[PDB]
């Protein structure tokens, strides 16, 4: 089915500019629209879309209305300008979904065999790569529940396209690019420890929280099964590197040698050619 | 150079060949693959200088 | 009568549909329609841009369907903001995006339908990132030949718009037309996330996932050795001796700074061992 | 800001291009060059290396539009 | 159970809990290679079995307590020295 | 079952777009029989053919659309 | 009667413009492939992400795009007197 999806910044702003529509006029709920996808392969891609008037009552938390007259004719408007472009599902800005979303997806399954909902974020905050992707399947359950429809998380990645970077990448203008080789890798090292060890601390605190309350999730079993894959080496004090110690510096072997050897020749290029060219102009000027 | 490349960008700067000069202010210009075209002033190169 | 310098306020939502509908029609030229509101004489805003069907037989004035707009405007009523139509635009991917014979024919047709109907052109090929590209123009009345041809006031944006002068045929089309300046009203709410969403997904995909390595060092030490001896023969060519060869010649750059960054890469890449671990 | 401008000219002209045949160098920074069709055009050469890659006669890739020497 | 490694394991320790003869430790550890619970290659010179990967099973209340001891320890030891790398080296970033 | 007429209008308007495709070709082509299916790399299947021109160019377009490949030999 | 909607939607995919064909010559790098069109001009162009390693080939005909001149799909080359034979 659908493994991964690709969300462009263009369709994302089509959710954001509609937040300026219902934001100034109010009132409740959020931005909800129909998503126009493009399927050239198992990987899913999204280019454009169209926002539809949508409302969801609170009380009455399960009440939702799509507009099919706006869904029908405008599709033919977009089908005429773009033939390959078609609706792959719907979307919304969340941030957190509600149980009623089982009815929104099941109603539009007449248009598409599988509708993929995209939860986006209008204001970026935390903790990382934004928005979200969900796919609608039926896993039933191990406990004996009736057949259950639960949206499974789909990995989402942003992507670019030709001619769309004209105004987009121009308006920012404030970023330093890239710069690969100096600050690019070392900044992420401070981030991969930050973002890596905070979700670590966040999850281990939730694992302790599972003992107190919140059982189920049992999970099961993905919690500890994937944790033990991390446990191939812990690493614990100290590092158990007795076999990897003499190999450690052995990886630093070529790195230090190429450093000292080339820098000595780079110095021979820097020192010699400078003193030559400097002694030339200096003493011959006066 | 980027501004100079723009002047050479659109169709590219070609090399013409003048077979003869005319008294009508137009100068015959021949492209190697193509035929013999013609163009008028051209105020940089004078008519008698062609 | 009285004419003042006009300024185009564009929305980031309008700029996307410009190049995206333009990329869909590539290579061929499309015909669109501009959507927005007229605030006053000296400023004009385009708050939206919608897609229009491409013409495979060539652009014609009949490509714009009036009942297509009546249903589109009806869809804007149920939408949050139902703003009135303003003007038209067309992409020109195949060339330097100049107004063609069809572009002027739809001018007098649309300028009778709407007041301004500012002509907007765009091309993908001119640049990639750091150039606005696009285009803007407005038809000046040819019957004004009896009156003066030289408005407007506020020469600031007029002189900056006259430069670079964009080749020749564009200024050759300045007959019957005049350009118009384009500025960006602040999108910084979304423009802050536009830089954030782009760089967060462009840094190692999580910023984690990327941390070709030693195999590229064997390729690097080839560029740190084999490229060195060929570049260090030239200082021997600097000694003539002396002096029968044309001087000065500077062979220092750019490979010396490449070897600098090459060792900066491998040393900070070796730090990945001591960073991730302890 | 200058290194950012250096990254620009490094990309440009990138792709695509057209194959052509270099004829001769008339002066500095610009030379006449023929295309695959054998069209001799007046083209500004790329400003990085004007010497060892110019050659008396060589097959050079020219830009699709400008037919630029890079 | 153990944090190890302590990866390569001698035959006497396996022959203790499994109470198997030394001649049958061959079929013991090598059959699990076909089962898929461990891919470890055996070192037959000193007869010390070398484990690779691991097979997780179930969980226990003490396993969560053993996890929290050895999990956050990798978090707090790295984040400690991680700020040390950010301490001095940040001056060259700017 | 009354959606026919509204659906019959778009086939004539698309044929009206074929009627602007009727007027008018400056190009005449020669036909080449071809069968092409490319596995990726979910699956894209179909058939394509090769197209010549009177200007000596040779183009590439999927199998027509309208008249199918049942007729005829190139 | 939905076959009409199916037939017209297939004709909507026919709005996609046709490409041009050419013969591969050599390859300078991965981002530049020498290709000779049937007319005789030779271009070095990039490529898209839908192709595979079998697209390159030792001098076999390919289909160049009409914009960036990129290759879409490859087909076996024949001048086709033989079917007439
Ligand atoms: Zn046009």
TrEMBL record, chain G:
GO molecular function per UniProt: ATP binding; ATP hydrolysis activity
Compartments where located: Cytoplasm; Nucleus
Keyword Lipid biosynthesis: no
Top-rank taxon: Eukaryota
Keyword Transmembrane helix recorded: no
Swiss-Prot/TrEMBL keywords: Acetylation, ATP-binding, Coiled coil, Cytoplasm, Metal-binding, Nucleotide-binding, Nucleus, Proteasome
GO cellular component: a single term: nucleus
Family that this chain belongs to: Belongs to the AAA ATPase family.
Protein name as it appears in the record: 26S proteasome regulatory subunit 10B
Organism of origin: Homo sapiens (Human)
Gene name linked to the record: PSMC6
Portion of the parent chain present: 51 to 135 of 403
């Amino acid at each position: 089915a659908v493994q991964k999806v690709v969300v462009h910044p263009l369709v994302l702003l089509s959710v954001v500019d509609h937040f300026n529509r219902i934001g100034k006029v109010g009132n409740q709920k959020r931005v909800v629209g129909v998503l126009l996808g493009s399927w050239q392969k198992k990987v899913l891609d999204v280019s454009n879309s169209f926002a539809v008037p949508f409302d969801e009552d609170d009380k009455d938390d399960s009440v939702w209305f799509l507009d099919h007259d706006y869904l029908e004719n405008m599709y033919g408007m977009f089908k005429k300008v773009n033939a390959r472009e078609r609706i792959v599902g719907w979307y919304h800005t969340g941030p957190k979904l509600h149980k009623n979303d089982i009815a929104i997806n099941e109603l539009m399954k007449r248009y598409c065999p599988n509708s993929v909902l995209v939860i986006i974020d209008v204001k970026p905050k935390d903790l990382g790569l934004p928005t979200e992707a969900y796919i609608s399947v039926e896993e039933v359950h191990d406990d004996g529940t009736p057949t259950s429809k639960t949206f499974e998380h789909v990995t989402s990645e942003i992507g670019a396209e030709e001619a769309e970077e004209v105004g987009v990448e121009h308006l920012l203008r404030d970023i330093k690019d890239t710069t690969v080789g100096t600050l690019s890798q070392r900044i992420t090292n401070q981030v991969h420890g930050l973002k890596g060890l905070n979700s670590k601390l966040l999850d281990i605190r939730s694992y302790l929280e599972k003992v107190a309350t919140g059982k189920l999730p049992i999970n099961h079993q993905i919690i500890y099964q994937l944790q033990d894959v991390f446990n191939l080496l812990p690493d614990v004090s100290l590092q158990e590197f007795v076999k990897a110690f003499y190999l450690k510096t052995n990886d630093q072997m070529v790195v230090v040698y190429l450093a000292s050897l080339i820098r000595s020749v780079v110095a021979l290029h820097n020192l010699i050619n400078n003193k030559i060219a400097n002694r030339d102009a200096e003493k011959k000027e006066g | 150079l980027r501004e100079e490349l723009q002047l050479l960008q659109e169709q590219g700067s070609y090399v013409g060949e003048v077979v003869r000069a005319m008294d009508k202010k137009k100068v015959l210009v021949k492209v190697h693959p193509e035929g013999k075209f013609v163009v008028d002033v051209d105020k940089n190169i004078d008519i008698n200088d062609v | 009568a009285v004419d003042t310098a006009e300024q185009v306020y564009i929305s980031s939502l309008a700029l996307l549909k410009m190049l995206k509908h333009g990329r869909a029609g590539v290579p061929m030229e499309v015909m669109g329609l501009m959507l927005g509101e007229f605030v006053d004489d000296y400023t004009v805003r385009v708050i939206d841009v919608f897609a229009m069907p491409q013409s495979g037989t060539g652009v014609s004035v009949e490509a714009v369907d009036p009942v297509f707009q009546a249903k589109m405007l009806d869809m804007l009523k149920q939408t949050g903001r139902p703003e009135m139509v303003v003007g038209w635009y067309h992409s020109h991917p195949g060339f330097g995006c100049w107004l063609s014979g069809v572009d002027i024919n739809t001018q007098q047709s649309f300028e009778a339908l709407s007041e301004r109907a500012v002509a907007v052109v765009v091309d993908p090929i001119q640049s990639v990132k750091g150039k606005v590209v696009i285009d803007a123009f407005r038809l000046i009345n040819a019957n004004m030949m009896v009156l003066g041809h030289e408005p407007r006031q506020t020469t600031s944006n007029l002189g900056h718009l006259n430069k670079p002068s964009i080749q020749a045929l564009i200024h050759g089309l300045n007959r019957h037309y005049y350009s118009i300046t384009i500025n960006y009203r602040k999108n910084e709410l979304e423009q802050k996330m536009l830089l954030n969403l782009h760089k967060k997904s462009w840094m190692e995909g999580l910023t984690l996932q990327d941390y070709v390595v030693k195999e590229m060092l064997e390729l690097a030490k080839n560029y740190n050795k084999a490229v060195e001896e060929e570049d260090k023969m030239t200082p021997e060519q600097l000694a003539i001796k002396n002096v029968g060869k044309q001087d000065p010649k500077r062979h220092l750059e750019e490979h010396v700074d490449v070897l600098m960054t090459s060792n900066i890469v491998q040393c900070l890449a070796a730090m990945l061992d001591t960073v991730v671990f302890k | 800001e200058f290194l950012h401008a250096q990254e620009e000219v490094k990309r440009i002209q990138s792709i695509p291009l057209v194959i052509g045949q270099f004829l001769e160098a008339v002066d500095q920074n610009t030379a006449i060059v023929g295309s695959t069709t054998g069209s001799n055009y007046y083209v500004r050469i790329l400003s990085t290396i004007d010497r060892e890659l110019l050659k008396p006669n060589a097959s050079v890739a020219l830009h699709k539009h400008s037919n630029a020497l890079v | 159970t153990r944090p190890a490694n302590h990866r390569q394991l001698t035959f006497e320790e396996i022959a203790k809990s499994a109470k198997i003869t030394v001649n049958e430790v061959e079929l013991l550890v090598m059959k699990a290679l076909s089962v898929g619970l461990v891919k470890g290659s055996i070192d037959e010179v000193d007869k010390r079995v070398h484990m690779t990967w691991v097979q997780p099973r179930v969980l226990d209340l003490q396993q969560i307590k053993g996890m929290k001891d050895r999990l956050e320890f990798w978090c707090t030891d790295v984040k400690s020295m991680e700020m040390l790398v950010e301490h001095q080296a940040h001056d060259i970033l700017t | 079952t009354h959606e026919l007429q509204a659906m019959k209008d778009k086939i004539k308007e698309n044929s009206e777009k074929i009627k602007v495709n009727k007027t008018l070709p400056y190009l005449v082509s020669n036909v080449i029989e071809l069968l092409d299916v490319d596995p990726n790399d979910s699956q894209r299947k179909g058939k394509c053919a090769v197209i010549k021109t009177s200007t000596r160019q040779t183009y590439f377009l999927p199998v027509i659309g309208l008249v199918d490949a049942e007729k005829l030999k190139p | 009667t939905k076959q009409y909607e199916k037939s017209e939607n297939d004709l909507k995919a026919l709005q996609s413009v046709g490409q041009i064909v050419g013969e591969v010559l050599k390859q300078l790098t991965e981002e530049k492939f020498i290709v000779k069109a049937t007319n005789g001009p030779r271009y070095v162009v990039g490529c898209r992400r839908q192709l595979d390693k079998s697209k390159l080939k030792p001098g076999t005909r390919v289909a160049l795009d009409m914009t960036t001149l990129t290759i879409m799909r490859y087909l076996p080359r024949e001048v086709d007197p033989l079917v007439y034979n």
